[PDB]
């Protein structure tokens, strides 16, 4: 029961996915050759949530790896845990996507998507009771954004009563990584508003801030950033894979975190994150962890949470702890600072607890916030997009693939509507 199918699309999506599979593997005591070397029966009890068993006690992640160019996936295969994946689950094209949503969604991606869908169907048929799908991609490129969105559309059409959740890497206000980012992001976001149940919004600038300000890390690698993201990802599904006092679930989280269907864009966080120098200096108390969790500096989106209000927040705690303490802390936060929580939803904080903590920690926590502050990201994207579109700058690359102006206007309209909705509850 409760099988989850993973899809990783494009460069960033595949890279983050590799790290995620490493982390999950280590959590379950699975080595790169698919052999189990754990010490606890809890490690295998719910291994089926992420893994499929093969002859000779081999475990193979239910992961589908998708790209329009072979490089990234060749690197992944060459990598440490790369040999753990099913070879038949690498689905790739030959021509690149040129950071072009239209190529991912309408042309190059359209040619490949049926093949991906077939693999997806095959995997879903092996599920006793499939919970849903997890997707990893970027919003600013062509493959993860265009192809990824397309895949989501297809799967929701075919499996409309399953959970569809994405970890989506978004552009950052200071330092864009591509010139057409606003166009791609807007085109993706338009589709995600209507075709996903929840989306975790990750901002690389926030990750860098975490690495520098919090972790005191002089020289963060993308690998290190990926690790953090993977940790957050693992947190979300912990309650499917292990016992607890309050057993959470994806669906439960959705129920408690989405008060209106379109408002499903979350700011993720993780705790504790402490510098290697200052480890003995910190006392690892639930209160202190809570404080870390709620600190804007420990968020992974391009928002100031203090510039908005929390509609709902879900906290998932890992390790041994007093439920009394947890509840009291939650009460204290809300009573003290009631202005930062929407007044029309009493008890804005939901708590879940899983007994088994991650490696190397006695306690940890994962934070998921639905804040009206997220509107700032959307507003900024919209401004950027309009700045370009009003001059039809770069547009020939998209019209050449058959897109029309009207689609862009529709996207803009959707964006603005979303922003307006967010402003309502602000």
């Amino acid at each position: 029961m409760r099988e989850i199918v993973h899809i990783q699309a494009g460069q960033c999506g595949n890279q983050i996915g590799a790290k995620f599979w490493e982390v999950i593997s280590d959590e379950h005591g699975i080595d790169p050759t698919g052999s189990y070397h754990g010490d606890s029966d809890l490690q295998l009890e719910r291994i089926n949530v992420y893994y499929n068993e093969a002859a000779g006690n081999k475990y193979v992640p239910r992961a589908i790896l998708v790209d329009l160019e072979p490089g990234t996936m060749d690197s992944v295969r060459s990598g440490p845990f790369g040999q753990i994946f099913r070879p038949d689950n690498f689905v790739f094209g030959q021509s690149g996507a040129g950071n072009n949503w239209a190529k991912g969604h309408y042309t190059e991606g359209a040619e490949l998507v049926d093949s991906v869908l077939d693999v997806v169907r095959k995997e879903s048929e092996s599920c006793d009771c499939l919970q849903g799908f997890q997707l990893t991609h970027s919003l600013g490129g062509g493959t993860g954004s265009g192809m990824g969105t397309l895949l989501i559309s297809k799967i929701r059409e075919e499996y409309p009563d399953r959970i569809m959740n994405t970890f989506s890497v978004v552009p950052s206000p200071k330092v864009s990584d591509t010139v057409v980012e606003p166009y791609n992001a807007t085109l993706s976001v338009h589709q995600l508003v209507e075709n996903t149940d929840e989306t975790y919004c990750i901002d690389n600038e926030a990750l860098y801030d975490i690495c520098f300000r919090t972790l005191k890390l002089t020289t963060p690698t993308y690998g290190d950033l990926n690790h953090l993201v993977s940790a957050t990802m693992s947190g979300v599904t912990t309650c499917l894979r292990f016992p607890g006092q309050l057993n959470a679930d994806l669906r439960k989280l959705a129920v408690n975190m989405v008060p209106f269907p379109r408002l499903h864009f979350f700011m993720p966080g993780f705790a504790p994150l402490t510098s290697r120098g200052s480890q003995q200096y910190r006392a690892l108390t639930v209160p202190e962890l809570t404080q870390q969790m709620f600190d804007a500096k420990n968020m992974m989106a391009a928002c100031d949470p203090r510039h908005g209000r929390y509609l709902t927040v879900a906290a998932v705690f890992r390790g041994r702890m007093s439920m009394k303490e947890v509840d009291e802390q939650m009460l204290n936060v809300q009573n003290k600072n009631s202005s930062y929580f929407v007044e029309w939803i009493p008890n804005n904080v939901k708590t879940a607890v899983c007994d088994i903590p991650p490696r190397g920690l006695k306690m940890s926590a994962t934070f998921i916030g639905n804040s009206t502050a997220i509107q700032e990201l959307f507003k900024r994207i919209s401004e950027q997009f309009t700045a370009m579109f009003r001059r039809k700058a770069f547009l020939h690359w998209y019209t050449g693939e058959g897109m029309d102006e009207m689609e862009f206007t529709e996207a803009e309209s959707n964006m603005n509507d979303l922003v307006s909705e967010y402003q309502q509850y602000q």
Binding site: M1, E45, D128, N247, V255, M323, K324, D327, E328, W344
Partner: protein
């Protein structure tokens, strides 16, 4: 002989049930491998098997039970499982997913009934607020009502606290449960987690608690309630008596459950722990196991269940003293507002536990207009939420209708009015 069947539904309920079963085993000397009739059905190999129904839509808690210490004790059926939980959604319990499992549960219940020569009725453990414990439990109760009718249907329910919670669709679910268990359940006994925490802070002198402790506390209360069926004593109370004594009107049937003395080893020696003192403690505002002041409400009917060393004279004296106090307000229409139950068997201490051994302990079940305030608060919360149509798409998207909510609200209002009337 006197026989009753337990039903444990959800996560919370199942947790409570584990504790209860442990307590029972400790009481009757049964080993974890099964090596009494009231709770344990006996088979032809010197083996004792619980007479319970264990239900969960998520296969996790049940799985834990199946792997843990008391796995050989339970039957491989009594422990029932599903595939996906309701996820704090009354609609997925009552309408969508519950009607897949309910039949099986009913069958099991019937089987259990068949194995008894005098079924006193049912004890059900669920939670107002949880997805399964709200809807599924309600569904089950309705079915039971349809089937048996005049078999006792007692409920043990975890009421949501006012100033603390663990789920932001908890008002809706609870309201729905209230709506659909108002014409079925005869008694719904109440415990609140915040209250328990407060008690721990105050009396036990412990401020690092966990769910296990709470469960154990609940189990103690349960044992006290059920001690008259399993041991001798003056004034042997029955499951059928509670209904008679604590339900003045059929809609009004939520009484609070409190236990004394809840005290650690250090100040067990300092205290005398006489009967009168214990009785006094039982009626004290802070010692109550919910978040309500009984100073803001009149006691309709109270039931006291003394367990251990008790001279009935002393109990009588205590009751008289209580009556004398100005606060302790009773209603105009209920002068005789006390029921008294006594057992020779003392309480039983659970190894690695919170509580020490005592000579005598008391469990009080009280039906009062203090809960009206709580109900009102809940209603207000619901109103605040439902005004914007928040979360409604989840419930409506699996069976429910816009209008049902309104009906529920109306029902709640009616209940409040009734309470007000009673107060006069």
């Amino acid at each position: 002989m006197r026989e009753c069947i337990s039903i444990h539904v959800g996560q919370a309920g199942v947790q409570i049930g584990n504790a209860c079963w442990e307590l029972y085993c400790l009481e009757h000397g049964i080993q974890p491998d099964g090596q009494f009739n009231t709770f344990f059905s006996e088979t032809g190999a010197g083996k004792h098997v619980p007479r319970a129904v264990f239900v969960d839509l998520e296969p996790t808690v049940i799985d834990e039970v199946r792997t843990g210490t008391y796995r050989q004790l339970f039957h491989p059926e009594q422990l029932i499982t599903g595939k996906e939980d309701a996820a704090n959604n009354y609609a997925r319990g009552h309408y969508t997913i519950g009607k897949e499992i309910i039949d099986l549960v009913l069958d099991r219940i019937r089987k259990l009934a068949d194995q008894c020569t005098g079924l006193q009725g049912f004890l059900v453990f669920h939670s107002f607020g949880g997805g399964t414990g709200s809807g599924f439990t309600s569904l089950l109760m309705e079915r039971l009502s349809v089937d048996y009718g005049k078999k006792s249907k007692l409920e043990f329910s975890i009421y949501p606290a006012p100033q603390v919670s663990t789920a932001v669709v908890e008002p809706y679910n609870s309201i729905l449960t209230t709506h659909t268990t108002l014409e079925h359940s005869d008694c719904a006994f109440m415990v609140d987690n915040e209250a328990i925490y407060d008690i721990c802070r105050r009396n036990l002198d412990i401020e690092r608690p966990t769910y296990t402790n709470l469960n154990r506390l609940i189990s103690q209360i349960v044992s006290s309630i059920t001690a008259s069926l399993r041991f001798d004593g003056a004034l042997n109370v029955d499951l059928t008596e509670f209904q008679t004594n604590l339900v003045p009107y059929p809609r009004i049937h939520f009484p609070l459950a409190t236990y004394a003395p809840v005290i650690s080893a250090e100040k067990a020696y300092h205290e005398q722990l006489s009967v009168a003192e214990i009785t006094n403690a039982c009626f004290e505002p802070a010692n109550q196991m919910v978040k309500c002041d009984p100073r803001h409400g009149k006691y309709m009917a109270c039931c006291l269940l003394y367990r251990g060393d008790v001279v009935p004279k002393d109990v009588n004296a205590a009751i008289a003293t209580i009556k004398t106090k100005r606060t302790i307000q009773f209603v105009d229409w209920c002068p005789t507002g006390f029921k008294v139950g006594i057992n020779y068997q003392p309480p039983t201490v659970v190894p690695g536990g919170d509580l020490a051994k005592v000579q005598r302990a008391v469990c009080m079940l009280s039906n009062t207009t203090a809960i009206a305030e709580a109900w009102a608060r809940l209603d207000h919360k619901f109103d605040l939420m439902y005004a914007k149509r928040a979360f409604v798409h989840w419930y409506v998207g699996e069976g429910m209708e816009e209008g049902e909510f309104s009906e529920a609200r109306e029902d709640m209002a009616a209940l409040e009015k009734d309470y007000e009337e009673v107060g006069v």
